[PDB]
Amino acid sequence: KLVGHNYPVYVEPVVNIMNFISARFVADSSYFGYTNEIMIMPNHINVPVDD
Amino acid sequence: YPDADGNDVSIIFSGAMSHAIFTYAQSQWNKNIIKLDDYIREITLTVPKQ
Amino acid sequence: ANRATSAFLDNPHPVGVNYVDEGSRQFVAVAELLASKLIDSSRESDESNSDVPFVQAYSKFADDNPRHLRVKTGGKMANALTNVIRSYYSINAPAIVPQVEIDRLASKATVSGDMYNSYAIFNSVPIVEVLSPARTTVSIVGSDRADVTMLNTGAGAANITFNFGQIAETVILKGSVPFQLARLNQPMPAARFTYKLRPLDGPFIVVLPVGNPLVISATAATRIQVPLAFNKALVESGFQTAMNDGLFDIQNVNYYSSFDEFIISQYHAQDGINRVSTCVILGLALQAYDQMRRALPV
Amino acid sequence: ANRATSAFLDNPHPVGVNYVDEGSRQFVAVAELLASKLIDSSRESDESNSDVPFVQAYSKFADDNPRHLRVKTGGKMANALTNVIRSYYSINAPAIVPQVEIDRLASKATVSGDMYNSYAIFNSVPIVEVLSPARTTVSIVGSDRADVTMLNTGAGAANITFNFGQIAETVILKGSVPFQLARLNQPMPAARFTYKLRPLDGPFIVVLPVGNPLVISATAATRIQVPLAFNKALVESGFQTAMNDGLFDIQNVNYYSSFDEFIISQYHAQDGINRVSTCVILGLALQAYDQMRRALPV
Amino acid sequence: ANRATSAFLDNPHPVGVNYVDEGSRQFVAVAELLASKLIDSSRESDESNSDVPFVQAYSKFADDNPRHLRVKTGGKMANALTNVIRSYYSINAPAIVPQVEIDRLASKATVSGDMYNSYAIFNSVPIVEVLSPARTTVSIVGSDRADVTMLNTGAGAANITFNFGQIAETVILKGSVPFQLARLNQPMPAARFTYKLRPLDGPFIVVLPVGNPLVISATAATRIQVPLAFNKALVESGFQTAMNDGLFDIQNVNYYSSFDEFIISQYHAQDGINRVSTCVILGLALQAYDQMRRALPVR
């Protein structure tokens, strides 16, 4: 019943708000402190960085 | 500053995500705030004809 | 022995060889996903009387917040998508966009760049050649529905050879009158209105009686591997907008009425397998072009 | 006197009489509902960068979790959906799926298998017969747009009788040059480009002047009751998929270019109202087949 | 000299000049929005075996509660929508919907009646005229794809003029056999199968050799500004539904196979720019009509 429940046409606004925050959490990860890629390198290698 | 209607618009410095989440929440609640006359019209359809 | 062939199968021009790697495929898939949200936010904003869904969608696409005194161009992504479409069509088109810009834009969203998840059916009829003897006239008209008109003025019945290639899966032949069709060096059957044939079965012979014209109507179906987000209605709309906008205008390239004809023609050319892969990526790119242009009319 | 008829209206084969009760109709509705979620799950997977939305949708459809070892086939629902499609096309196809299996699959989702909620417009042009006098040539070609080419080599003008049947609602006739058309026992009007006609009105007479050939383009609109979930774009794609996948390869059956031609041909057969209901259910089944197979190619 | 023209471009009847103000445009947009809710609610009602979703949507649409004894046809909103559709099609159709009813029905939902947010592509190929010499026969057939069949019986090769309307953006020509086409007072190129043309450049000339006939297949693409809610699939379905119900049965009007033929034909007439705006509003109205009739069926 939980799996097969369909969203009602007149959904409560709180559901829409939470879906908006959930979408932002996955789409914009840097705002919330996690990323999908890291790079580990030795110090003697010089790479351009955000200055 | 005032808008075309009587609402007051605040222009402030704030974060992008806090602005998006707050303003979107305002729109969702504002959809269900209706005038009393429109509310009376909705009830009259439900109640009997007299 | 006169020879007649379909117009759209003639001389397919080489396609671009750039922006076909795994990194570039992710860029096209990401642009399609972000453009789809852009067209959905615009529809929601109109009804809801609040522009917050559109502002968020435009910020993701263009990396800059919408402004009232500035044009809604679309940002770097819109410029990049326009130039990549130019490169796909012809090998002579320059590859302006650097690889660094493509990689940066592809990181905006996470989406598999797989272009072999699903399939789409294409309805162009590949009549490679129709061989007819002397004293007979043959005309081929149409691409979606191929109309072959044959008239025999000789003394006896003639044999017309039909070659539908080996790429198309099924071809259905309908005639204005019952007619006889059989494979090469095979016994002829009794006359009937409709024939369902496999193009790989071989060239087919049609017996043409003397005196009355016979018109054969041909319909074909071909299956090509495409990403799951592929929508044929949106690809076709993007194709015509792309042509009208003029980004397909390069020297020594063939022009086609629909994306259906464009992809079948490239398939039937030499090394058609390799050409089709680039065409599918172009189709998904055109799908994003249609959705983004409709949301932001420039 | 010569008689010309549409090629696709000739000899409609009998359709199946099984799987058309209330229990089986809800099975097709459930398959259409659950196949739609299978396609929509792919889009949700991209947003979350996880395969758990697709796993949930596949498990409901196939009663089993997907495995990386084997190709996703759809399980018992896919096998049942494929077999009922075969049975709908021809009476000779076996009805091999048990009722108990249809019973269990129809209970997965809540639906009403009512196929008369809405209507759809089918564009095939039925020309039952065109009666022409001697020394005149008449050629009928096309289904969606029927082009009738008429040439008379006689001394005087000839009268051509057009019979569009009794099922179609509206037929529009457009000529290359202005021509005259009127019903039986009616005065003939001034030459006019476009005629709007109702096939129930009766046979129509066209004056064919001696000289250059006259070509009449015909378009038709017919309304057939269909369920609310009907989508003509998806039904047409499913028809081509089923034909290519060999679901219609049965003995003594006729083949058609589109579902548009298939449904109109059975409508115009004797006692054709029986076939329309069965063909509508087949269309909904093909709609589910198109979505299920695009998500899970085999 | 012989002249041949497309059948659907001949004599476009004038369109209505009423219900094109800002308030009337809002009414059409509201009807489309509310009809979409009606068609969705019927799906939910069928699935759940309950009339609650349909009663809520029908009451919003028709401002009345469904009753078993009466017949559900859409109410006053349906009556206004059908009568405004007839007004758009022809100037002979009357205007019988008062402005009070239009204003009342536009207040049901808050939408912006902007018909120029987006664009749509229409595929009707306009062949305004084809001019041929005395000894040549030219036949034009088709609207979505125009097949022009030409046969030359004279001793010398004939020059045939093709005039496409200035409105269309792109025209693509494909021949059964290679042929030579060039602009007026321009050198003839080598024979090739396919040509891409912009009709604004000028009239085109085709060289016909003596012998076997040449058939030219024409396709065109034109962009017309439309609202974002525009859906060509729904608009086309509504156009055929209106024709079958007799909504367009007005005196001294022309009939067309599709909405694409209607909008292109009206564009190519004088004052075409004014006419296209009304046709677009009629397209949205037909989209609302199709969704309303499918939700509420009459056998």
Added chain:
Amino acid sequence: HALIKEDLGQWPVETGISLVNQAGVFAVQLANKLGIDKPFVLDAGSNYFT
């Protein structure tokens, strides 16, 4: 050097657990922090100095 930072807090995520489940749980807490979980209207017209 100066910079502007938007601090919405730190919300660690786990790789094994589904992100949608974690995003939804974090969504409830974020809505409560911003005060948008319940029906509300903004009253900020008085927050000014002349």
Added chain:
Amino acid sequence: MDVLSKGSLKELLAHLEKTPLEEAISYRIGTVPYQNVLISRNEYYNQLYPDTTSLIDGVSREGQRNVNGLIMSIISYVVSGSGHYIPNIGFMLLRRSILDILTKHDTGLVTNNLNYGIIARNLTVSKMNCEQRKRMLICFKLLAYKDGNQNDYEIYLNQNIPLKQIAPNFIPGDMRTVIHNQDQLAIVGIPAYRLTQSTELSIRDDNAKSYKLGYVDWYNSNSFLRERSEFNL
């Protein structure tokens, strides 16, 4: 909607005093009247419903540029609720009240040549109800007494016997007649609860029904919206 709500002669005359001639003239181009048309009434019939258009419908129609057209536009506003399209009448004339046009000579309009029989036929008096006819006769009496044509109005009533039975009992220029009048002239009022949201077959009946159903909503909301634009003028 306001003019149709008046139910007494003294209310109707008071409304005409405050209403400029601009409200009786429409800026919508409309359609030519007296046209046999087929309209769609799907609540009742599948086929199209024959009807004829008229000036006293609720929809604006094209009007003539003569004085006859302006008088017909005034009466149509009183009996139907909408005027007609007469372009470029004049700023000075449009500012004058409706009663000033009908009952005063300072306006600059000449109405002596008007034929009351022709005006009634153009307005389809045969299709008008009792309340509409009484309103029309009020406008005729006001025009007749202004021009010194009191005898012509009486002779016109003698020819049309059915119009004589419902003739209003007021003499223009006498205040006592207006005070003691007991006529009922309300086309639109607060509906009896039995009224439903259903269509009517005729063009006139449906448009009148639309005004009746929307009167309750108009009554509650007209004052605030009028004041929102009236203030700071």
